Design an enzyme around this catalytic site. Structure first.
Site, PDB file in Angstrom:
ATOM      1  N   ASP A  64       0.765  -1.208   0.000  1.00 13.58           N
ATOM      2  CA  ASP A  64       0.000   0.000   0.000  1.00 13.58           C
ATOM      3  C   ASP A  64       0.804   1.270   0.000  1.00 13.58           C
ATOM      4  O   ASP A  64       1.181   1.748   1.058  1.00 13.58           O
ATOM      5  CB  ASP A  64      -0.896  -0.121   1.200  1.00 13.58           C
ATOM      6  CG  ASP A  64      -1.989   0.912   1.353  1.00 13.58           C
ATOM      7  OD1 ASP A  64      -2.002   1.957   0.701  1.00 13.58           O
ATOM      8  OD2 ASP A  64      -2.858   0.652   2.168  1.00 13.58           O
ATOM      9  N   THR A  65       0.895   1.950  -1.136  1.00 16.48           N
ATOM     10  CA  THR A  65       1.621   3.205  -1.229  1.00 16.48           C
ATOM     11  C   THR A  65       0.970   4.370  -0.496  1.00 16.48           C
ATOM     12  O   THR A  65       1.594   5.401  -0.226  1.00 16.48           O
ATOM     13  CB  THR A  65       1.784   3.521  -2.702  1.00 16.48           C
ATOM     14  OG1 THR A  65       0.469   3.655  -3.273  1.00 16.48           O
ATOM     15  CG2 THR A  65       2.639   2.458  -3.358  1.00 16.48           C
ATOM     16  N   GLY A  66      -0.316   4.244  -0.165  1.00 16.17           N
ATOM     17  CA  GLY A  66      -1.014   5.295   0.563  1.00 16.17           C
ATOM     18  C   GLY A  66      -0.723   5.275   2.054  1.00 16.17           C
ATOM     19  O   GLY A  66      -0.802   6.325   2.696  1.00 16.17           O
TER      20      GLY A  66
END
Ligand SMILES: OC1(c2ccc(Cl)cc2)CCN(CCCC2(c3ccc(F)cc3)SCCS2)CC1
Ligand SMILES: [Cl-]
Lengths: 99, 99
Positions: free
Chosen positions: B25-27
């Site tokens: 998850d880049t968020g």
């Protein structure tokens, strides 16, 4: 472009004739943007989190230009604390994760 | 590998001797995993979400293999619905966003 992840991956998106800042988020199924009204009818949607739900409006074939790349998809508009590009628009610009 | 985003980017990680499936998850700035009994000293931590907070256990120099790549960092452990491996360990394995 190549985005490393030392800093939050924030980019500019042009949507509804506005230039906004959004987070490229591979952990989001859906795109969630701060309030504004777009062209079209909208379906009510109630999205969830940890201790409840947030009501948002769903707009459906919206043109977005993420770092110059044009993409078309569903946008949810509502009281989100940050603009989030979900995978529904990331697949459209051909974004991949690489390591 | 180069992973596309048509389906959720789930990978097999190995942490505390047990194999787990987690979302890249880049968020998310952090790595938050389900209840597992990690050997180690820990601190309580709160992570806020939609209308509330959940308490987790912050552990600090944990070795985590992610598709064979070992990374070391902080893992928050607790009642997450979804196992999140965020930016703090993605930078360590050299994960990027590209389009
Ligand atoms: O990471 C969380 C978390 C995970 C585990 C633990 Cl223990 C604590 C917190 C806390 C944050 N939410 C974010 C929901 C993401 C979506 C959304 C975006 C913006 C918005 F205003 C509403 C919804 S993006 C599309 C649908 S929901 C997920 C779980
Ligand atoms: Cl939430």
């Amino acid at each position: 472009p190549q985005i490393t992840l030392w800093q939050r991956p924030l980019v500019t998106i042009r949507i509804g004739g506005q230039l906004k800042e959004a987070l490229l988020d591979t952990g989001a199924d859906d795109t969630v943007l701060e309030e504004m009204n777009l062209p079209g009818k909208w379906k009510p949607k109630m999205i969830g989190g940890i201790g409840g739900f947030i009501k948002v409006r769903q707009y459906d074939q919206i043109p977005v230009e993420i770092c110059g790349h044009k993409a078309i998809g569903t946008v949810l508009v509502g009281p989100t604390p940050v603009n989030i590009i979900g995978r529904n628009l990331l697949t459209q610009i051909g974004c991949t994760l690489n390591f």
